[PDB]
Amino acid sequence: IDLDEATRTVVVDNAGNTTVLTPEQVKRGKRLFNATCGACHVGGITKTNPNVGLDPEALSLATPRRDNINALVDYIKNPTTYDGLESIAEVHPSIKSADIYPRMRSLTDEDLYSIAGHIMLSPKIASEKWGGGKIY
Amino acid sequence: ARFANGKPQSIEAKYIMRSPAEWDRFMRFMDRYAEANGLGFSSXXXXXXX
Amino acid sequence: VSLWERFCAWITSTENRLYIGWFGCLMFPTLLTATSCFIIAFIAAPPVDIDGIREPVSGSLLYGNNIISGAVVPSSNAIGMHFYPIWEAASVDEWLYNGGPYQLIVLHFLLGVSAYMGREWELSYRLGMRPWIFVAFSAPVAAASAVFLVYPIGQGSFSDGMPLGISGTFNFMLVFQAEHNILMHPFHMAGVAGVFGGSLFSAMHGSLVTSSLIRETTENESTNYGYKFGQEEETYNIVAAHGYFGRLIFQYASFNNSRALHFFLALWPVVGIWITAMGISTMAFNLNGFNFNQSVVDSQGRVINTWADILNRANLGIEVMHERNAHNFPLDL
Amino acid sequence: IAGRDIESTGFAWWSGNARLINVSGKLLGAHVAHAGLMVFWAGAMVLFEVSHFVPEKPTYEQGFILIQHLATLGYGIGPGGEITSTVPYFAVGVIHLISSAILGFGGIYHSLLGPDTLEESFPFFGYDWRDKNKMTTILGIHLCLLGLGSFLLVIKAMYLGGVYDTWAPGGGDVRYITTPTLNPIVIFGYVFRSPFGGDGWVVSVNNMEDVIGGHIWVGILCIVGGIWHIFTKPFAWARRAFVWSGEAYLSYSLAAISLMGFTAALYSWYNNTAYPSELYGPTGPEASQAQAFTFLVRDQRLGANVSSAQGPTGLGKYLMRSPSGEIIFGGETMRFWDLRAPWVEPLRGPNGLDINKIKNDIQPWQERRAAEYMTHAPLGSLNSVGGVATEINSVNYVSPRSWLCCSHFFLAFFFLVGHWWHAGRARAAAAGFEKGIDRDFEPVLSMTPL
Amino acid sequence: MITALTALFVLVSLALVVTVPVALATPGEWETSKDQFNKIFQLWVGLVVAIATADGIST
Amino acid sequence: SVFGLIGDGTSYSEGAAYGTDQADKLYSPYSVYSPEGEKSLYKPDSAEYLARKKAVLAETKNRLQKIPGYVDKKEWFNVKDELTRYMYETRGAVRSLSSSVTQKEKAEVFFRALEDTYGAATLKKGDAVKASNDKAIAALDAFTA
Amino acid sequence: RPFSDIITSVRYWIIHSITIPSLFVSGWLFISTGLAYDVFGTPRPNEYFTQDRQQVPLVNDRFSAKQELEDLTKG
Amino acid sequence: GRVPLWLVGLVGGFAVITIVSLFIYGSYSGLGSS
Amino acid sequence: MLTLKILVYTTVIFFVSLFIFGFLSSDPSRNPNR
Amino acid sequence: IFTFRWLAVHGLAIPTVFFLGGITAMQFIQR
Amino acid sequence: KLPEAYAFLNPIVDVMPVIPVLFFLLAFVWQAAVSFR
Numbered sequence A: 001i002d003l004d005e006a007t008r009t010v011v012v013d014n015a016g017n018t019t020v021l022t023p024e025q026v027k028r029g030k031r032l033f034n035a036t037c038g039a040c041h042v043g044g045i046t047k048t049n050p051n052v053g054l055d056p057e058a059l060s061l062a063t064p065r066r067d068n069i070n071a072l073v074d075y076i077k078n079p080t081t082y083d084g085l086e087s088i089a090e091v092h093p094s095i096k097s098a099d100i101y102p103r104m105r106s107l108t109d110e111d112l113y114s115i116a117g118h119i120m121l122s123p124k125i126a127s128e129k130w131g132g133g134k135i136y
Numbered sequence B: 001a002r003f004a005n006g007k008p009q010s011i012e013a014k015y016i017m018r019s020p021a022e023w024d025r026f027m028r029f030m031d032r033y034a035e036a037n038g039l040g041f042s043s044x045x046x047x048x049x050x
Numbered sequence C: 001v002s003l004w005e006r007f008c009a010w011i012t013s014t015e016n017r018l019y020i021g022w023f024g025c026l027m028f029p030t031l032l033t034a035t036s037c038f039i040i041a042f043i044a045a046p047p048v049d050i051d052g053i054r055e056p057v058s059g060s061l062l063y064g065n066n067i068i069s070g071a072v073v074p075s076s077n078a079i080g081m082h083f084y085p086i087w088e089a090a091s092v093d094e095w096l097y098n099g100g101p102y103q104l105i106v107l108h109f110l111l112g113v114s115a116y117m118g119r120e121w122e123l124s125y126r127l128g129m130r131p132w133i134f135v136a137f138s139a140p141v142a143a144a145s146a147v148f149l150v151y152p153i154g155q156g157s158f159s160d161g162m163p164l165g166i167s168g169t170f171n172f173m174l175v176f177q178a179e180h181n182i183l184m185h186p187f188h189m190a191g192v193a194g195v196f197g198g199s200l201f202s203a204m205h206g207s208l209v210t211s212s213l214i215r216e217t218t219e220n221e222s223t224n225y226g227y228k229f230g231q232e233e234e235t236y237n238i239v240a241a242h243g244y245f246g247r248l249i250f251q252y253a254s255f256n257n258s259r260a261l262h263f264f265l266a267l268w269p270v271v272g273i274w275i276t277a278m279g280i281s282t283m284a285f286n287l288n289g290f291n292f293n294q295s296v297v298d299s300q301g302r303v304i305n306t307w308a309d310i311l312n313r314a315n316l317g318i319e320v321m322h323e324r325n326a327h328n329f330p331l332d333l
Numbered sequence D: 001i002a003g004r005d006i007e008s009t010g011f012a013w014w015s016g017n018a019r020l021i022n023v024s025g026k027l028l029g030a031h032v033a034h035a036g037l038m039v040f041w042a043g044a045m046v047l048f049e050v051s052h053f054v055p056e057k058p059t060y061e062q063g064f065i066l067i068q069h070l071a072t073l074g075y076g077i078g079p080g081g082e083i084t085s086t087v088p089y090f091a092v093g094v095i096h097l098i099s100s101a102i103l104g105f106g107g108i109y110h111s112l113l114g115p116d117t118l119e120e121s122f123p124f125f126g127y128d129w130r131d132k133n134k135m136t137t138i139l140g141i142h143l144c145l146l147g148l149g150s151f152l153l154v155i156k157a158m159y160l161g162g163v164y165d166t167w168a169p170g171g172g173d174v175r176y177i178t179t180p181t182l183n184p185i186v187i188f189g190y191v192f193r194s195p196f197g198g199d200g201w202v203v204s205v206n207n208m209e210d211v212i213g214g215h216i217w218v219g220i221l222c223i224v225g226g227i228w229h230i231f232t233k234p235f236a237w238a239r240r241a242f243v244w245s246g247e248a249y250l251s252y253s254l255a256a257i258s259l260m261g262f263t264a265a266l267y268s269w270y271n272n273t274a275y276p277s278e279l280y281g282p283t284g285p286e287a288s289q290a291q292a293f294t295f296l297v298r299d300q301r302l303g304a305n306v307s308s309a310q311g312p313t314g315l316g317k318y319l320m321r322s323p324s325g326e327i328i329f330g331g332e333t334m335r336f337w338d339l340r341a342p343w344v345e346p347l348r349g350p351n352g353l354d355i356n357k358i359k360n361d362i363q364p365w366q367e368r369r370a371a372e373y374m375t376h377a378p379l380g381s382l383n384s385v386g387g388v389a390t391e392i393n394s395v396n397y398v399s400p401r402s403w404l405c406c407s408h409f410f411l412a413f414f415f416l417v418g419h420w421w422h423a424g425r426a427r428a429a430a431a432g433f434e435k436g437i438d439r440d441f442e443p444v445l446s447m448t449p450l
Numbered sequence E: 001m002i003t004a005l006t007a008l009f010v011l012v013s014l015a016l017v018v019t020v021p022v023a024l025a026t027p028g029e030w031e032t033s034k035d036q037f038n039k040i041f042q043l044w045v046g047l048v049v050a051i052a053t054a055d056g057i058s059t
Numbered sequence F: 001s002v003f004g005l006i007g008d009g010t011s012y013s014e015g016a017a018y019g020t021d022q023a024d025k026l027y028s029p030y031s032v033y034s035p036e037g038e039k040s041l042y043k044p045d046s047a048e049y050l051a052r053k054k055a056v057l058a059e060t061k062n063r064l065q066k067i068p069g070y071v072d073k074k075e076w077f078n079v080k081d082e083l084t085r086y087m088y089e090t091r092g093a094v095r096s097l098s099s100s101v102t103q104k105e106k107a108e109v110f111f112r113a114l115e116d117t118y119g120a121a122t123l124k125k126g127d128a129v130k131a132s133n134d135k136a137i138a139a140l141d142a143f144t145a
Numbered sequence G: 001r002p003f004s005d006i007i008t009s010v011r012y013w014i015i016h017s018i019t020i021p022s023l024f025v026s027g028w029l030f031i032s033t034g035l036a037y038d039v040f041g042t043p044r045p046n047e048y049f050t051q052d053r054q055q056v057p058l059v060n061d062r063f064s065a066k067q068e069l070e071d072l073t074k075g
Numbered sequence H: 001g002r003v004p005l006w007l008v009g010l011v012g013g014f015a016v017i018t019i020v021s022l023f024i025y026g027s028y029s030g031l032g033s034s
Numbered sequence I: 001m002l003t004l005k006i007l008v009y010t011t012v013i014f015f016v017s018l019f020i021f022g023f024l025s026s027d028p029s030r031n032p033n034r
Numbered sequence J: 001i002f003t004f005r006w007l008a009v010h011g012l013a014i015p016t017v018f019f020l021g022g023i024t025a026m027q028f029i030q031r
Numbered sequence K: 001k002l003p004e005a006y007a008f009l010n011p012i013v014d015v016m017p018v019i020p021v022l023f024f025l026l027a028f029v030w031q032a033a034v035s036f037r
Ligand code: CLA
Pocket: D003, D004, D005, D012, D013, D014, D015, D016, D017, D019, D020, D023, D026, D027, D029, D030, D031, D033, D034, D101, D104, D105, D108, D111, D112, E016, E017, E020, E021, E025, K024, K026, K027, K028, K030, K031
């Protein structure tokens, strides 16, 4: 089995529209995610706050929905709590807190799009370990 | 315990009594070695002269 | 003739049944107190809390233990790396509750073995022989120091040292595997190679020497009786043994300068044990062995397990179970 | 070739450098060339790290080992441990490279064309391994050089731009140490204190004032000792306990340097003052304290009454009491209660961890620092997988503290072994039975039976 | 210019390092060819000073 | 099959090649060794972080006027803790906000005053601490420019 | 004849510069052409799973192992 | 005895160093590199 | 328990001084050959 | 020429070179 | 990253740090050249 066209299609928006990630995008993401996100979100789990995981099920229950590329990209632009009552940009990496966190001082849009695509795509490949944890 | 401490003397008694043992040794050692100033052997680890 | 002189002389005498020497002045009292405390504690030491969670563990014979399960439990985790002599406790009972005897015994044992090395060298000097046996003995001393002192220093607590017992030793080894992956560390591999090679070379050298023994005894008398203490000629034929060894494997491949052979015999296990003690010391500061977890990936991206992943599975099984009540947070730092 | 063959010398090719024991000029050439090698490595590695530098990541994540030292000296570093520019590091690297070229040429010249023995032509640089006055003179000269170097460090920290201080008000930054502590009692309290937990023999220096004062004292002591050894001659008591030969001096140096290597290895693993966590990453205990702190904060946000929740063992899972009574973080990290970090001190009162400060006056930057330190603990593998041994390999990080400590501990022990070997051989050779027994004067046969 | 200037410096340093070790060894070779080596040493230090002057000025 | 010679005799790969040090087209990998780019997209140097810095300075003031009250009582740990817990962001904020030479020089003066306050508080000398706090107040309320 | 004499012989290297590289290139082409996958039955990186089965293809019977493997290794 | 022993020794050392180096480069780019 | 500390501090300095002054008493001269 | 040695040596060396060539090709065969 | 002037000369720096190790070996190759006299 390959990383074919069927398995590279992910939700792009709330509606449900589904775009396709080019293989280059996949690579760049896996790189960017491992370089910046990996230290705390290795394996699709949140190391500091294990309750708020990164698996698609938890993203589906966040407020608002975080199970599509657009909402993940917006979350990077402007992060909120699990219920979305207030912003936690001062305690989470974000473009809004670019001054606080120097890592994002260079990230571009495509970079964010590729990172979100990787986050969306990895549970389609592994399908049980993205956010699973030790057990799996 | 973790109170830093010069050496570990906490009570003047402890220092004043760790004293006589070392001084006793110094005296017994001086008993053999006394009035020595010269006698330079000038050889590789000889120290033959007593 | 002074008194000091007379003493110094008796001390460095080479006609005493056991050589005392100046290093003996440190070796004898220290080892004697260590062994006295160890013998008493192995019989009548009360339970000790090792994880500092008020869950004492019994390790004494009089507390329902046998020789294998019994041990001298290391000091409490609450103490950590702090010095805990007898006089710092408010009572002897409390000193026993927090595992002070472990600290006493281990510190004295380390000083004693260092002084033992020194005494070996000192007697070598007195007898006019070449002074490098204590260099060979350094390897077990280094291993003992790494397992008893360096690892607690790196981890930050004396509760992480090896308990003085059989089942305690096995527990220490298993937890070390779980938290550090000792097997996949090249220095442990070097140590296993050194020990296996030491056994191999010992057995082969003994077989080759005993096989080629000059016929100087009957059949109804121990072959060992042919040799007489203080001989002037070799009781064995080097030529026959070398011929057999060369015909067995290869002609080029063979040692002739028996001196080179014995030097190699000394060199192999010693360097193996040195490298192993360095593995333990390096891993005391969290430089673990190779982690080949999920290294093989198919085209799609799914992970294909190797033999290393089953090792990781066993390590997880050991890890989630060791010190069940001690942990409160997800990471073991 | 007279001096370079197992016949003329008696030393095999593998132990070939021992042929230079009695050759003065060639030994000097070897020493100088080796120093040139050291300088070359320093410059080359600095240039390598500057090349592979990435401004996004902190230095302790890039696997760097030398930029941290020059940053601690106060070169191209801003408040909070941010790196501004990497030009001074490049300058240091190139200067070291050029100096290494010069030193290497000098070593080669003295080893190849220089006179074999310096005693005949230059009766000022020639020695004998056996006279004590010249040995002490050389020792005193180099001791004065070392004292001048310690002075130079003090001068750099006091009047040449200052040094980086983590405990500085408002965060870590470069400052001038105006008032170093000169009290002999406080300075030598480090030297004469216990090496066990809670004491930290020389590793437990806290503020920069103590560092500067200790360096002033070391420089003064070294200058005085260097002057004193130059003028005087070894006394009677030291003249009959020491073996006076080149290999004996080498063995003494080996023992001393093994002790120094052990000290530096354990010093890089525990110290926050001369090894700021913003550059070397958090220490062993620091990561554990950071984990406990961040989970305490997270559970406090939910509304749980911290310092009132009994742990699974009934001991308290957030706040405990130290065996001395101080209030500390609970869990397995109670072994690390001796920790003192710049981001946790604001919360500490005279009684320990203040509770009113924790409940009310918490800061977001402390949360970020604790999360970053927990996410970057000194854990790793030989292939630098990072994290716990059971973790999958996605991150790529091993803390420089682990590298430094492990490497220098290994080197220190092997230099202790070198001390053992060389001390034994030097004493045997001085006595005169380093080659065999005798076979006609065997001392065992002249001693009483037993 | 700097980039080039240094390039040269690297080339001349390579030419010097490949030939100095061979000289010293080969008995006698040294003395006879001392003045050319001195001239090349002066060229080397001049190149270093020129590179330093470039940078400085250019900053 | 599917070879992968050091990015010179094959191709990229959804994951296998590493020699690359390029082969991405996205744009400039800052350096041949950095996945990230240069500072020319998204975050801007001075968007609206200056407002946050000014707020940090105002609250730094508010923190620093309660030091004389803490030194009037013989409490020294509180002085150090107050001077380090929230002033932590203030060093970087003041350094970044300063752009002219006068601001730089007198921010240096303010840092000197704060360091003197810290040292005197450690040495437990009330007069020196009070004078240093007064000088720090003067510099800081003369900084708002 | 001792090893070193043979190793230093020129007529040895004139028969060890047309034999060794050819053998090395043949070993390279053994898997460059993908023959080794078919000879030993090991799966290629894209043959571990198929569209029909998404789990590990284990053998459960003994005397019908041939057919079972033939089926599993269908696609 | 035409070719000196240490020359062929050096050539063999270069070959083996090359092969072993190609192995680590691989531990890094391709199968098994994750 | 201060008495116990005193007695141990004596024993320790006792034996340590014995060691230090035993090795200072012209030990290299003590040897088979002279 | 074909002494037992030549034989044993070649029977051990030919597969070794074959396998080394094969293993090198693999180091490139990248997923 | 190196200053823009020396980014061209970067590849030499990429190999410079590992030089010393080779010096060591040179000793061994030099000894081999003289027949491990
Ligand atoms: C840092 C390591 C080091 C150093 C400085 C030395 C130094 C020395 N060794 Mg030596 N040695 C070493 C490691 C080292 N060794 C090792 C590891 C071994 C074990 C294999 C030996 C084994 C050994 C033996 C067996 C002998 C020496 C001898 C000597 C001395 C004379 C060497 C000689 O005549 O060279 C002759 C060699 C050459 C002329 C060829 C080398 C060409 C040059 C020097 C190489 C470097 C060039 C450099 C890269 C160019 C830089 C130029 C600069 C301007 C930039 C000399 C003092 C000899 C001795 O005792 O002297 C009395 C001797 O017999 N050594």
